Amino acid sequence: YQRFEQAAAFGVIASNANCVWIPAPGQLITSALEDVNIWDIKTGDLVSKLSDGLPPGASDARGAKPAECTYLEAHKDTDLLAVGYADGVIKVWDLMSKTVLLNFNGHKAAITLLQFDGTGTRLISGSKDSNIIVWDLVGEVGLYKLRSHKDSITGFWCQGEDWLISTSKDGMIKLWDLKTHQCIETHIAHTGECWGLAVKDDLLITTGTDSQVKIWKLDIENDKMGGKLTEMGIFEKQSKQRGLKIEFITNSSDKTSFFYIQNADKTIETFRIRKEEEIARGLKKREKRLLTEEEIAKSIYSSFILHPFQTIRSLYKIKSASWTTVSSSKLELVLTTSSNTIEYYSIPYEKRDPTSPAPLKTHTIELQGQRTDVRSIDISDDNKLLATASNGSLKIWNIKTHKCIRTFECGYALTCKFLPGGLLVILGTRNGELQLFDLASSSLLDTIEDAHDAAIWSLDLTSDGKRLVTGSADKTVKFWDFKVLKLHHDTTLELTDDILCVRVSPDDRYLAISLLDNTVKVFFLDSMKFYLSLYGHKLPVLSIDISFDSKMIITSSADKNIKIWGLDFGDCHKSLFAHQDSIMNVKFLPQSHNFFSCSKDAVVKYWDGEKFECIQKLYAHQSEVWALAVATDGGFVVSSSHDHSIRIWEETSLKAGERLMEALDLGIAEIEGLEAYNRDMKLWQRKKLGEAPIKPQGNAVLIAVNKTPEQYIMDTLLRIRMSQLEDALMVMPFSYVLKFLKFIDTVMQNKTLLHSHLPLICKNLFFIIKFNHKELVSQKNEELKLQINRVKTELRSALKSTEDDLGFNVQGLKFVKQQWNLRHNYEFVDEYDQQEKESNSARKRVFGTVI
Amino acid sequence: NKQKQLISCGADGLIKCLKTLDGHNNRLWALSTMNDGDMIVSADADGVFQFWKDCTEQEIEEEQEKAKLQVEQEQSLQNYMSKGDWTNAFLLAMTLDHPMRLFNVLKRALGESRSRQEVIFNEELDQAISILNDEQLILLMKRCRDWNTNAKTHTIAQRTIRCILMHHNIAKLSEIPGMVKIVDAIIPYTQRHFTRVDNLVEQSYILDYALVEMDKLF
Amino acid sequence: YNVGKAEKDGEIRLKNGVAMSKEELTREDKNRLRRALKRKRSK
RNA sequence: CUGGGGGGAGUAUGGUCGCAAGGCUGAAACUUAAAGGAA
């Protein structure tokens, strides 16, 4: 088969991520969906779209959504870009050659921050799941995983090798000793979430849910447990929403610091922090009226040391920001907003006055976007493309360059079409209005106010183009002719129900209209004849398509399935269930019975109309695919979605016993090696110090598991099971029994792991010598005789030491119970009433017996 | 202030349902709530009055101050489990009531007590277990009771029972309400552990029999 | 006396004897103890 | 306020006249949604 693929994607400038700024104002790296694009603020031309080397839609593209980029981060000097994606992976690229250097999957959810540290070679990464991982770049390895937060890492701040400090989407800020990787000090920052973190070395600043911004003093050289990071006071903002990024600078040329808190909505609150001279010369002024009350006033600091500044607003909702500074009169701040647009503002400040009632944007890159989701896409014969938006941004892109060359202002517009000669656009809007535009001249040929009483929903030209059909939610369809280049309403068909799709056949034959009442009706255009009524879809029914032979129609709806109908008798053929949310649009190919359907769950799907298979399952969008349009000839198809994207699609095993034996042999070899080393040390310290042994290096596996040999043998002796322990001890020969006795003799000098394994040592040792008693008492060596005596003394001392406190506790606890009894048990002198009282007050337990 | 409301004379003022107030000893013809927003609520019985405080936001600050305290001194116990110094770790795990961490501080302090060298822990730890009150020692003996049911974890329980017995007053231990259903529960466990360790030390003398055979060898 | 279940709700008390507190268990042991309780319910 | 078939208790029915089964519903021209049932 001649399958499909993706040629190019565009329409996005700023997506659901952050932005990094690079100096030459300068350029900007930001996110498109799953690929990063670089822009020069000066002009705004797309100078780079760094993308994955595999086209989404190819043979090896995997069966899921692609990983949306979610955090840009840049190493300036050594020229790297660490970008991180929605599944958790981190790709590190060199910006010179634009290839992938490092892949750093690691995480389990989406990631939320990156940071290079010690400028090169180290990258720390925080994610939706509460881990935060340190990575080395000269080893390609996750070094450390700091794991104690609970919800989602909202920010952190590190210095090199000793201290990190993170704050997460619970209420908690944490300080991490990066030598031990244990959390040192934990506070509750804000009572809900904690969304911000910034610090200029003395003061730390955090923000939470609503306007309460908290100043902290971190004293890194502190020694107390609670008090490495203390809280110094709160203050307020003007926004009652989530401040979610704070960032600082030190402008030179005096020395000064500025920080911003961007908000959820539309607003960045900028702040100047002042200097120690005006701290000292402002302290007395609030210390006026002359001291317990004045000390309470001086303690209740934030408004003192912090100074608000020019509160920069924007048109849309703010997603990310970053700035640069010179002279303290060029706080030059780039800002990517949600409705895709970047904006380069710059506030001046004459070091006492900010010299403006409201700041000024110096650049704005917004030409290659829409600010809303494209509710309708269209195409020329083959050359141009039509994108229809809610703000009014009709845009005429071109296929061969992916640049909008022509754009207008219409309104909440949901459907549009071209006109068959090209260079002319019809369009209908949300309210009762229709509009006409062109390509060479300006916007409005004419608008028709009161084109319909209510929301228009779908229009269609005839194949010659002179006559178009508009169906609207005022329960009417209308017909319009082109009189000479103006619209002529002549007839109108009022239905009982809100018509929401129209279509004609591609040979002027049928008019199929989709009603809100779960059905479609097929009419004859030449008679308004009411040929057919196709029924049985069971929810209101979206896009129709008529085939090129005018024999076969498709019918999409919000029932998550498309139905194929034969138009000769109105008989159904398939009812194939696609698309688990809602099929928004469905379109045939030009010459074939193959078709495409794009849906509300971020997927387009390629089907055939003969076997009714799914030919292909294309997976490049991230959100609700609102429209798609096929070429008139040739058959390449464009699809446009809710993530502001427009994309083209073209054609192409030991056991117990022997484990204990090998553990015993290496353990006792290490043990008597160290004992020979100690005898060598005593002889070369008691004799002429001219020589000694060189070095016994400790065993590989013993230093690899970090265990003394007694502990190594002790845990493998633990790890054999009780059912095969009497076999594990019976398999081993008498030489291993003798070195087992050496092992027990050494282990009851370390009285820590003697007392934690007393019954195990007793059981194993007594079975060993009880089984090997005949040979043991025939061995003739005073070393083993002294060994047995030493083991006997230390073992029996440990056992009598534990049963001493056992017997003590028995007699003490029964004394306690008995003195409680003789204090207040009861008063019976008569033995029969006494025994009946004790029988009524006894402990009962009921048992299931068999008779 | 919009929608919840006060009613009177169950024997008490009640708000809308939640928060039965203190009330009185008998009946009631009284409500005056009408200062600034909804300030001081006078509610009067036959003779006795109450002047109910303010907007009820005082409790939430107190309510939000404990969780902060508990999450602060939960990240002191982890530092103590890291670096040792088991005494404040012990009393603070007793305050938090973290039972397996309590078993860990007692077990590792007991192991190092076996290591180095009247006193059975370090002396600052057993005076710290000497100076704890009735609720703490009764929950300490609840979980010494349930640790004593093992044959492995029983030694830590026996030595904690031993230091309680030799650092507290025995009449006080009897008069604490609840500590006669605990000691009845873990006397017979100590009895079976005594019989088991006595059987183990009586079958320990095959080493001595092997020594006398090895001496009769020559 | 035999070790039943805990008389609190932030506590997990196995019949071994080892009482664990839910505030002191990490999330790995929380998932592991939940699956183990699911096994002991399912049998 | 005159008009009457033929005992009681049962049994069978290859006759005639009826009433009645199926089998998840939605759901067929469509192997089709939501939701419900059952286990």
Curated annotation (Swiss-Prot), chain A:
Pfam families: Beta-prop_WDR3_1st, Beta-prop_WDR3_2nd, Utp12. InterPro entries: G-protein_beta_WD-40_rep, SSU_processome_Utp12, TBC1_cilium_biogenesis, WD40/YVTN_repeat-like_dom_sf, WD40_repeat_CS, WD40_repeat_dom_sf, WD40_rpt. It is found in: Nucleus, Nucleolus. GO terms for biological process: endonucleolytic cleavage in 5'-ETS of tricistronic rRNA transcript (SSU-rRNA, 5.8S rRNA, LSU-rRNA); endonucleolytic cleavage in ITS1 to separate SSU-rRNA from 5.8S rRNA and LSU-rRNA from tricistronic rRNA transcript (SSU-rRNA, 5.8S rRNA, LSU-rRNA); endonucleolytic cleavage to generate mature 5'-end of SSU-rRNA from (SSU-rRNA, 5.8S rRNA, LSU-rRNA); maturation of SSU-rRNA; maturation of SSU-rRNA from tricistronic rRNA transcript (SSU-rRNA, 5.8S rRNA, LSU-rRNA). GO terms for cellular component: 90S preribosome; nucleolus; nucleoplasm; Pwp2p-containing subcomplex of 90S preribosome; small-subunit processome. The keyword rRNA processing applies. Keywords: Nucleus, Repeat, Ribonucleoprotein, Ribosome biogenesis, rRNA processing, WD repeat. WD repeats lie at residues 64-94, 106-136, 148-177, 189-217, 369-398, 408-438, 451-481, 536-566, 578-608, 620-650. Present with 9620 molecules/cell in log phase SD medium. Interacts with snoRNA U3. Interacts with MPP10. Component of the ribosomal small subunit (SSU) processome composed of at least 40 protein subunits and snoRNA U3. Belongs to the WD repeat WDR3/UTP12 family. This is U3 small nucleolar RNA-associated protein 12.
UniProtKB/Swiss-Prot annotation, chain B:
Interacts with snoRNA U3. Interacts with MPP10. Component of the ribosomal small subunit (SSU) processome composed of at least 40 protein subunits and snoRNA U3. This is U3 small nucleolar RNA-associated protein 13. It is found in: Nucleus, Nucleolus. WD repeats lie at residues 24-62, 72-113. Involved in nucleolar processing of pre-18S ribosomal RNA. Present with 8070 molecules/cell in log phase SD medium.
UniProtKB/Swiss-Prot annotation, chain C:
Component of a heterotrimeric complex containing IMP3, IMP4 and MPP10. Interacts with snoRNA U3. Component of the ribosomal small subunit (SSU) processome composed of at least 40 protein subunits and snoRNA U3. Interacts with the SSU processome subunits EMG1, IMP3, IMP4, KRR1, NOC4/UTP19, NOP1, RPS4A, RPS4B, RPS6A, RPS6B, RPS7A, RPS7B, RPS9A, RPS9B, RPS14A, RPS14B, UTP1-UTP18, UTP20-UTP22 and UTP25. Involved in nucleolar processing of pre-18S ribosomal RNA. Required for the early cleavages at sites A0, A1 and A2 during 18S ribosomal pre-RNA processing. Belongs to the MPP10 family. This is U3 small nucleolar RNA-associated protein MPP10. Signal peptide: none annotated. It comes from Saccharomyces cerevisiae (strain ATCC 204508 / S288c) (Baker's yeast). The gene is MPP10. It comes from the Eukaryota. The lineage of its organism: Eukaryota, Fungi, Dikarya, Ascomycota, Saccharomycotina. It is found in: Nucleus, Nucleolus.
